[PDB]
Each structure stands twice: as C-alpha cells, then as structure tokens.
Design an enzyme around this catalytic site. Structure first.
Site, short mmCIF file in Angstrom:
data_model
loop_
_atom_site.label_atom_id
_atom_site.label_comp_id
_atom_site.label_asym_id
_atom_site.label_seq_id
_atom_site.Cartn_x
_atom_site.Cartn_y
_atom_site.Cartn_z
N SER A 145 0.81 -1.23 0.00
CA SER A 145 0.00 0.00 0.00
C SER A 145 0.86 1.29 0.00
CB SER A 145 -1.07 -0.01 1.11
OG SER A 145 -2.03 1.03 0.92
N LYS A 155 -0.01 -9.99 -0.76
CA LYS A 155 -1.20 -10.50 -0.08
C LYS A 155 -2.02 -11.33 -1.01
CE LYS A 155 -4.62 -6.73 -0.87
NZ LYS A 155 -5.88 -7.54 -0.71
N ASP A 307 -6.55 1.21 -3.64
CA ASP A 307 -7.72 0.77 -2.89
C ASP A 307 -8.29 1.90 -2.00
OD1 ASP A 307 -5.65 0.66 -1.05
OD2 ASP A 307 -6.54 -1.02 0.05
N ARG A 308 -7.53 3.00 -1.86
CA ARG A 308 -7.98 4.14 -1.03
C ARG A 308 -8.09 5.41 -1.89
NH1 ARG A 308 -4.02 5.28 2.10
NH2 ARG A 308 -5.26 6.42 3.63
N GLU A 390 -13.04 4.51 8.00
CA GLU A 390 -12.67 5.91 8.14
C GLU A 390 -11.19 6.16 7.74
OE1 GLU A 390 -10.40 6.01 10.99
OE2 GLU A 390 -10.99 3.92 10.57
N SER A 391 -10.47 5.08 7.40
CA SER A 391 -9.11 5.20 6.86
C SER A 391 -9.08 5.49 5.33
CB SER A 391 -8.28 3.95 7.22
OG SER A 391 -9.03 2.76 7.04
N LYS A 408 -11.35 -3.01 -1.20
CA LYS A 408 -11.60 -1.57 -1.32
C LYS A 408 -11.16 -1.11 -2.69
CE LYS A 408 -9.66 -1.38 3.14
NZ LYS A 408 -8.43 -1.96 3.58
MG LIG Z 1 -3.78 0.98 -0.05
#
Ligand SMILES: [Mg+2]
Ligand SMILES: [Mg+2]
Lengths: 545, 545
Positions: A145, A155, A307-308, A390-391, A408
């Site tokens: 990440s 992963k 993913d974020r 919330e991250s 995500k």
């Molecule tokens: Mg990430």
C-alpha cells in the site's frame, strides 16, 4: 504536521538506492532464529524490506509455495491473477511468484508489458471470471500500500475477490515459516524463462475491461455531460494508466497533475512525519495537489495499490469520514435498482453522521468492528450496498446490486465524487456542509496512551456489565457495547454511546497502548468532556489488570 | 540531431524499470554458446545489460574470479580499490565483486556509505597508495561510462593506475569465458554478509584525499582569488559529491545546477539519437546546462565515471578538439617544473593545431595511434606532461611532473578551464579564438563508407610505399605513415600529411566500413579537396582485394 519538513518536496538525501535495495532482495536472507525476519502474513499479507531482512527472495518463494498449496487444497483450479504496484520490491517479488506458481502448475494471468494493477482491479477480475461459473479464479496483489519506497508487500485474495481471512492467512504464514526453517527444500520453482515458456503465464490487458466496466457502477454519462474540470494526482501508483484510460475512454476533461512513475517516489511531498508515504488522505503528502486545488471543480488521488481515495475541492482535502457520510447519503438516493433490504456497512469508529444519514434514508445500518474483512461477504452477496472505513477505503455495488470489487476500490470512490458533483451540481464538501447544517457539525478526535501488557489484554476481555456508567458527558448512555451491533462480532474493546456522542476504546495492534476514538455532535467542549469521561471509564475498568 | 526529440527532456515512456532490470541481473542468464552474451572485456572492460543477457550475475562472478587470479599471477597482493558509478547495474555488480574478492582473500577498499567513485579517483588512489612502496594496490571501476541507464560495465586498472592493456584484458576475458562455460565451478564466492565479516572489505573516504590533492595539480588559489561565477551539471554521475566537496573545501562560487541522482536518469535531455546518454560532450545531452549558460563565467559537466569533461561558456559547449589545443598551449606555458624532458602526447586523429602549438612552444610532440592506452606509461613516468583523445578525455601531471591520474580525469580538465580563465582573464574559447588568429581556423571532418572484411583487412596491412601520390590537395606530401611517428606503433591504417592538411584512414572496429578523418588549415573548400583525394587514395590502395 509534526515534522519540520512535512509537506515539503522530498530532497535527494531523502531517497533510496533502488538498485541496491533490489540487489538486497537476492543477496541478503532472513536470520536463523530471528523473529523479526519471519513471515508475518495477516490481513494485508506480509510486508517488510529487503534491507531489514524482512522482504527477500526466501520470503516470497516460501509465501508463493504456501499459496499454491493452500489454493489447490481448497479446490481452486482456475487462474491466479497476479498484480503488482509501483514499489521497487514488487518487481523481484513478482518474478519469484511467477517462478513458484508456474512450478506448481498454476495458471497465472498478468498485466501485459510488465504493467501495474490496482488491488480493486485484481478483485474485479476475480469476480468477473468467477461469475462465468467455471474453474475458480483467485489472485495475489504485490503491494505494501502506501508504505515508504524501501518496503515490499504481498497478499492473497481468494475466489470471493476480497482479502484472505485468517482461516487462510494463518495456514499460509505457518507454512511459509516452516519452508524457511527447512531451507526452502519444499519450494517448487522453475526459471523465469521456463515459466514464460511453460504456457502457465498469460499476459492480458486488465485495464480496458475494468475501465469499460465502470459504466456499470458509476454514472459516467452524467459525468461526461457535466463537463467538469477534473484533476488527479496519481501519486506514482499502480492505477496511473487507469486514470489516463478513463479520461480517454469516457472523453473527460481529466488532467494528471504529474505523470511520474519513480521507484524513489522523489516527486512526493513529505508526510506529517517527514517520510515519503503515498497517503492520499494525508494533507502533507497531498500538498502537491492541494496547491493546485483552485484549478479544478474536483480533484483526487489514490495510494499506490489504488484501494484508497483522497477527495479534493477548492476548499481543500475532504476528511475521509465526511466523505463516507456524503457518499452513502448520495448512493442510497440514486440507486433505485438496489433492493429495499440492501444495507449500509459501517465500522464502529466511523462518524455517527453515517448513523444519522442512514436512519434518515430508512435504510439498515450494519455496524461492524474495524477491518474491511467484515464487509466482504455482504458486498459479495449484495446484502451490503456500501462498506467503508474511516481510513479512506470503501467499495459499493454495481447499479444492479451485484458486486464490483469485494476489496476496497479507490477508483470508484473518486469517480463517485465526480458523479455526485455532476448529478447534483454540488461537490461532496458542499454536500457535507448541508449534512452539518441539518444534524450539527460533529467534532471527532483520537487519543492514545500506554498500557501495561496485562492492561492491554484486559481491555479486550470486557463485558458490558463491567461498565456501570449511566451517563456520558451529561446524556443518558444508550448503549455499552463489547460486540458490534451489526454482525455480533467482538470489538476487542468497548464502545459507549449517547444520542449526542460516543467513544470507543481499543488496544493498539502494535504497542502496549490503547486508543480512544470519540465524537460529539454538540461541539468541541462537549467532545472534551467525553474524552475526560472515557479516560475515567477505561482507567476504572483496567484498574486491577 | 537525428531523432525528433533530441535535446528534449526525457518522458516517462523513455525510462527503464530500475528494480525489474536489477532483478534481471539475478534471474536471467547468458545463453550457453551465444557469443553475444559472452564476456567481452576490452579497453573499457566488459559492458552489457541484464535485460540483454550480457550483464548478469554470472558475468560478474566470472570476471571477478579472473581478476583475482590474474592479479595474484602478476605479483599484486596489496588492496584492490573498488569504485562504482551511479548506473543501476553497478549496485549488484559491486556486491558480486565483493563476494568473490573476499572469497579469494583479496583486501578490498571501498567508498564509505555505499558512495560513488570516479575513474580518476580510483586511478589516483592506486598511485598514491603505491608511491608508499609496499604490496601493490590495483583497482576495479564499475561503470559503463555514458552508456544508457539499462547498461552496466566493469573494468580493471593495474598498479600503474591506468586502464588495463591487452596483455591483461585478453587473459581476463578468456578466463572469465572459461569460468562461464564451466558453470562457474572455479569461482570462489562467499555471501555478502560473510564478505563484510571477513575483514577483507574496508570502507574509507576516498573523496577528501582526492579533493585536497587537487591543489597539487591545478592552481586552486588562483581560481579562488578570481572569484568567478562557476556552474556544474554533475549529470547524476559518480563525482557529484566531489563537486560539492571541491566547492566547499576551496570556498568557490560553484553551483550545482541540479543535484539529482536517479538510476533512470530521467532529468536528462535526450541525446542526438533520442537515447538517454550521459555524454558531457554532446550538445543534445547538455541542453539543460546550455539553457543556463549565461548564468556563469564558465560551467562544466562530466560523464558518469567522471573521466571525460564538457566545457561550457556563454558561447556554448566547447568543441573538445579545440579545448585540447587550448589546454596544451596553456599548460606548457604555466608549468615551469615540466622541463625539456616532458613531452606532449597527441593521438593520430587529433587536430594539427596541437602540432602548431607544440612547435611554437619548442616542445616535443609524441604522436601515437588512436587510444588513451598509449599515454599511460608516459604519464606514469613523467615523460608525458599531457595526453588527451578527441572524445573529450585527457589527463596531465601534477605541478612537480609526477602523475595524478594515469587514467582519464574529467575533474582536473574542468578545473583546468577555471585555472585558465582565472590566471589569464580569458576563458578557454577566447583562447581558441587567439589560436585561430595565429594559425588559421582549421576545418575538420570525418567520413565513412562501406568496406568488405577483406578491404578492412588490407587497410590495416599497408606500407608507406603503397601511396604513390606525391601531392595532396595541391601541396607536397610530407609524410606517408602506417606507424605512429611518436612511438612507432602500427596505426592499423594510413595517414598522409602536407604542411597544410592531412587525412587518416582506419577500418571501422564495429561496422563493415572504413573511416577517414581529415583536416585543413586552409579552410573548408581545401578540406573537401582533401576528402576527394583521400577517397581516391583509399580506393586505389584497396582496389587490390
Ligand atoms: Mg492501499
Ligand atoms: Mg567515461
């Protein structure tokens, strides 16, 4: 913003030697007897760095072997989608994976031309493949990440497309460590050249199917029509070509503010702590894009695995909680094909603005412990229309209420902000301002302090009865929880609620310490009273530990 | 400029994937029996790329073993100075050398903190060490000079500090290839960790002694006193910390125009052919510094191994051939301790301006064949004050007429330009203008045309009597040469001279063709008549077979 060079452009002195670190992957090994060098394969897989003896060839050979074995034992005979991000160590890791997977007779699908692939693009690929109802696909994502440039990660995502859970990860971890202890005798491997010639490695374009598929989850036509001036900082991450393809395919006015791909990430502004961290929700890391915020109706960024999401308007970088409440409020009023039963997933430390929005929509709120794992099954079977953390990570269903990504997905979350702006004529921050005018503007904070090892253990073995408090900062307590109300899963801590505020206390995952999250809809002074009382309650319950 | 994007900043699409390439060093290997993948260890050592199976772990293991054996056979038992440049593949190659040298019981001296070391810094270290008169030191420089980012190189410098000659390189090449064909059986190797624990690898600061030493070869006091505004583009090369240390130690107004170190070299402007090549004498590659040239009295750049130099003034990038003449004319008038026993080295194809200068100063001219190798012995014993080649590489003696570097030294040649400017009040280009006024401005060109392997063979086996012409472009022929007049070595071609011009013809070493170098002091029309007649002479002497 703690560090004195926080938010400032990285300097040459901040940078890694990419080729040296990569050499270290091959020429350094985990130390016999050293626990710091062992495989630690959890919810985000295994992460570490070759220069610290924690992300080196023996680790990845061992992990890949364990995954090949586990998936076969689990009756998975379709292909394995293996995607990688733009971290330096993703390159040697990717090769190790191909060598071992092909040796174990696994059919692997990879992005052509050694390209990069977002986490949600692997999830989406798995789901799309498995919908066909044949041999099952799964996948591996080679990313740590937003960790700094010297780190690697890997992963596993099983056939439901989400992150692997502990029934799989623990077995993988034990097996990989057994292989390391055994000198990798049990690892099957062929050369990279042999793997490519074997027929087991197929290179495809994962980008175009994902990009074309977006029209089935976000209102791309409304976005096109609105003619917004959109900006993106790809942050040198795995979806940089996805943004380019999205702009091309959908004919959007979407500008990449830079197009750098650099294994030193030297283009970054330093994070709050002076490190190079590709955190799309961090103001310091996002300083580059924020200096251009006046140029766009809306801008955004993603962490290296995509993913974020970070959402920027001319007003600044949105707080991730604020955006979740807005996304949910919008989606559940603009997705008529979602059944009346489709529910909203929320983690226990997220803002109660979510609760208020969900109650107002007459929708079911399913509150779960922290960790995206709690949303996977419900996204998969369409019972959760939305799940977020919330991250700054979330996912939601296609228009027809079937899943898009069960991991995500930063891309759909960013595009959703553009849909919102286009369809409603107001950007997501303006929407949040309206929520705040309706319900009040909540004040949220997180506290932390040390605890003894015994206190930390005690904190995760509370029962609601151990808490005798009947009021919290002047209001009657409406719940004392040691399990999440939505799914009945243990919090490993305590949440106490009133109609006006709440706190949740949880042990730290990495230190002998605890955290308290708290929030008040009455404002700062009331929140400070919640804090004082939360500390009082936690102290009282751990007094004998 | 040939390529459409020559002189433009590199784009992302131009860049290598550093970690992938570095991974290839370890996971790809040369193809058994394939001559293109063999060790080819010549004047510049062995160069290749891991992605082309020509610069991978087996090559370096094999070459290091061969060097360890060869140096022992040659009675060398002091330390080996092992320096590296800023190319990606220098990192894994460096590790390979350490592992093999330590395994062979060789004491290795390296730059501390994994730092980078210029070719002339290795050369100087060897000379300074050996002047002390105990076991002999030698060295290895891990560099492909200015080759693109995907390339690696490695070369050997014996105890005289100069590049290894064929008596050594051919033997090393054969042994390395024998080891390769033998599956590395005779390679002694221990782990990097073992090599570091062995006590054979000693880390020191090579920078400080080199920088302090410069005062004994260039007039640093005069440069300081002049207070010139100097600039340098370090071109992300091995001497970047050297320029910084020079500025600070000597308290110079010397600014680095950038301080980037990047294994993609993405900061470069593209060369004439669109490649990223760190060529300090290429106008296209130097476009960045040239854009800034009005900011400085004088500015410099060096190729990645820092053995070559580029000199910039507001008039632009100096022609290297012009600079050699200026350097010689200045040095032999500003070096009183270089007595009548100190000569001027010149290669066959360098400008006859050098002849004019040297005659004018009443000095001895020693004309040698193409190749810096012909200057090494004379530099080492003090009988050559200066030797340079047309591709902007040269070296010269300390003030007292003892050697500084017996390999090419880019740093001393750049600082000499500053000394010239400070001492005389005229920059080197201004000096060339004066030389042109005194002798005329010569017109120089290089021609090429196809040649059979057989014609190229004939071309190298000529004798003076085969040129029956008595005039060249209207002037009596004063020399017909098939050997260099200064040292009597075969030139492997032909040079014909008159008082006003000359041509030299040599077979190409890389193509089926011959090259003709031509120059006239009468001007371009006369030069073109020289060309016409040279082509006729070459045709005639080769009409044979
Ligand atoms: Mg990430
Ligand atoms: Mg060079």
């Amino acid at each position: 913003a703690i560090h004195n060079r926080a938010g400032q452009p990285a300097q040459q002195s901040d940078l890694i030697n990419v080729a040296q670190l990569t050499a270290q992957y091959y020429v350094l090994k985990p130390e016999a007897g050293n626990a710091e060098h062992a495989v630690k394969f959890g919810t985000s897989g295994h992460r570490g760095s070759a220069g610290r003896h924690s992300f080196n060839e023996p680790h990845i050979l061992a992990i890949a072997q364990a995954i090949a074995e586990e998936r076969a034992k689990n009756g998975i005979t379709g292909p394995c989608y293996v995607g990688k991000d733009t971290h330096a160590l993703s390159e040697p890791a990717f090769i190790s994976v191909l060598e071992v997977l092909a040796a174990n007779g696994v059919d692997v699908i990879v992005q052509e031309n050694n390209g990069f692939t977002p986490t949600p693009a692997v999830s989406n690929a798995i789901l799309v493949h498995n919908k066909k109802g044949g041999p099952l696909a799964d996948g591996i994502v080679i990313t740590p990440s937003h960790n700094p440039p010297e780190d690697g990660g890997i992963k596993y995502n099983p056939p439901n497309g989400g992150p692997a859970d502990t029934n799989v990860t623990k077995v993988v971890e034990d097996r990989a460590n057994a292989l390391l202890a055994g000198g990798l005798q049990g690892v099957k491997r062929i050369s990279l050249d042999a793997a490519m010639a074997s027929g087991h490695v197929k290179a495809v374009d994962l980008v175009q199917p994902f990009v074309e598929g977006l029209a089935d989850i976000v209102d791309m036509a409304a976005i096109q029509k609105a003619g917004l001036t959109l900006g993106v900082d790809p942050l040198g991450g795995s979806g940089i070509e996805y943004w380019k393809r999205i702009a091309e395919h959908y004919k959007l006015n979407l500008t990449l503010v830079n197009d750098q791909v650099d294994q030193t990430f030297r283009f970054m502004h330093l994070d709050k702590d002076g490190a190079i961290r590709m955190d799309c929700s961090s103001e310091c890391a996002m300083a580059g894009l924020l200096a251009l915020r006046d140029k766009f109706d809306l801008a955004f960024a993603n962490d290296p695995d995509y993913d974020r999401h970070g959402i920027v308007t001319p007003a600044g970088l949105m707080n991730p909680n604020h955006y979740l409440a807005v996304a949910i409020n919008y989606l559940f009023q603009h997705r008529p094909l979602w059944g009346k039963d489709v529910a909203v997933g929320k983690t226990l430390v997220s803002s109660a603005m979510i609760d208020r929005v969900v109650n107002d929509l007459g929708r079911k709120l399913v509150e779960v412990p922290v960790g995206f794992k709690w949303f996977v099954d419900g996204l998969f079977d369409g019972s959760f229309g939305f799940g977020g953390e919330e991250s700054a990570g979330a996912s939601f269903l296609r228009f027809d209420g079937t899943p898009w990504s069960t991991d995500k997905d930063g891309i759909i979350m960013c595009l959703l902000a553009a849909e919102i702006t286009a369809v409603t004529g107001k950007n997501p921050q303006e929407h949040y301002n309206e929520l705040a005018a309706r319900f009040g503007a909540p004040s949220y904070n997180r506290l932390q302090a040390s605890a003894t090892s015994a206190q930390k253990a005690a904190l995760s073995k509370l029962s609601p009865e151990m808490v005798s408090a009947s009021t919290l900062a002047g209001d009657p307590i409406t719940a004392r929880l040691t399990a999440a109300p939505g799914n009945g899963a243990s919090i490993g801590g305590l949440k106490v609620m009133t109609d006006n505020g709440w706190f949740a206390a949880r042990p730290s995952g990495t230190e002998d310490a605890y955290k308290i999250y708290c929030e008040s809809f009455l404002g700062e002074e009331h929140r400070k009273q919640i804090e004082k009382e939360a500390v009082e309650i936690v102290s009282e319950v751990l007094k004998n530990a």
